[PDB]
């Protein structure tokens, strides 16, 4: 029943270089609930990552949101990586300012 998680990495507010914002990693549609999420900055794990509680939808699949504070920049790359028992390897999704 392993349902692969769908992942979206986006900012709370529209990005502006040099203005603080919250970076979100919304993971949805997975099952079982056990999941591992990490958010990265230049390839290093961000230490203070806040996570909402895990809940589920009408089709029983789970969803959860991770977030942290960040300030957009040209040199800095931000990514979100997750690991679920349904994936042979961990998936890293990059923050793309326009999506």
């Amino acid at each position: 029943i392993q349902k692969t998680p769908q992942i979206q990495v986006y900012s709370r507010h529209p990005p502006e270089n040099g203005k603080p914002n919250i970076l979100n990693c919304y993971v949805t549609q997975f099952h079982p609930p056990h999941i591992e999420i990490q958010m990265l900055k230049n390839g290093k794990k961000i230490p203070k990552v806040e996570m909402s509680d895990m809940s589920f939808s009408k089709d029983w699949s789970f969803y959860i949101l991770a977030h942290t504070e960040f300030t957009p920049t040209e040199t800095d790359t931000y990514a979100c990586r997750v690991k679920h028992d349904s994936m042979a390897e961990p998936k890293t999704v990059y923050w793309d300012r326009d999506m």
Binding site: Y26, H31, D53, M99
Partner: protein, 276 residues
């Protein structure tokens, strides 16, 4: 208009160390109000919404009893189910159930729900008539038989008309500023030139509450819903949501396209085109 009080519960049979074996969350519409746990048989409760600070201690006192009780039943059902499907003793199984009740815009009882799933699949569901159950196989047919003989439906019906209605009305009256609102979306069309000369037009909708919205792109009067790229609605994290819909269009033909946003916070749908 039209509100709903909903609980999502999950019981796990092999949690791990420091992971709950029972966990449930409650929502009033699109706003989460609390979280309940049971890690090693020790119940925990946490508020997640403002109007919870106006909840007298007789509330948290009864809840803690409910969490311990439900956490106890859940672990029993997991074992029983495991035995009924003849599954081996060392597996990780999940049992999930949703309980809800909603009232119409005129605050009358509209209906109520009760459904369970075992391992990610429907298992049993209580019918709209709130008296019959629909099962999905021989095992749940065994269950349906028991809840029917025992008379269990009448007890959920009692709950619905009792605690559910009571909490909905109260949460709505005390959470008024939060739940009886509808913030309208901030929308705009972004323009991104692809390399083959063509361009992506992304229609954004930001900061709306409730989550229910409709973004649709149209060429002239042609609905492009099958051909457009859409992300599922996502939480901004401050109680509001966002969503975007993109279509790819050849350069020059940009004015031909229109985006329509429908939200209950809007007076009339917005119809955006790319400006410039």
């Amino acid at each position: 208009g039209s509100h709903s009080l909903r609980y999502f519960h999950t019981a796990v049979s092999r949690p791990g160390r420091g992971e709950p074996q029972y966990i449930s969350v409650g929502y009033v519409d699109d706003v989460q109000f609390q979280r309940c746990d049971s890690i090693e048989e020790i119940p925990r409760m946490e508020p997640r919404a403002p109007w919870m600070e106006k909840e007298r201690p007789e509330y948290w006192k009864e809840l803690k009893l409910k969490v311990k009780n439900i956490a106890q039943s859940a672990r029993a059902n997991l074992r029983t189910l495991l035995r009924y499907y003849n599954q081996s003793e060392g597996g990780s199984h999940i049992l999930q159930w949703m309980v809800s009740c909603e009232v119409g815009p005129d605050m009358r009882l509209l209906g109520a729900h009760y459904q369970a799933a075992y391992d990610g699949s429907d298992y049993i569901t209580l019918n709209e008539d709130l008296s019959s159950w629909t099962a999905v196989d021989m095992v749940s047919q065994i269950t349906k038989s028991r809840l029917e003989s025992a008379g269990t439906a009448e007890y959920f019906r009692a709950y619905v008309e009792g605690e559910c209605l009571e909490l909905l009305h109260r949460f709505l009256r005390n959470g008024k500023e939060i739940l009886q609102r509808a913030d309208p979306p901030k929308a705009h069309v972004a323009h991104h030139p692809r390399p083959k000369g063509d361009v992506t037009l992304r229609c954004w909708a930001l900061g709306f509450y409730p989550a229910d919205i409709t973004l649709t792109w149209q060429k002239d009067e042609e609905d492009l819903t099958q051909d457009m790229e859409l992300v599922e609605t996502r939480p901004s994290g401050d109680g509001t949501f966002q969503k975007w819909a993109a279509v790819v269009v050849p350069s020059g033909e940009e004015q031909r396209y229109t985006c329509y946003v429908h939200h209950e916070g809007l007076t009339e749908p917005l119809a955006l085109k790319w400006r410039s």
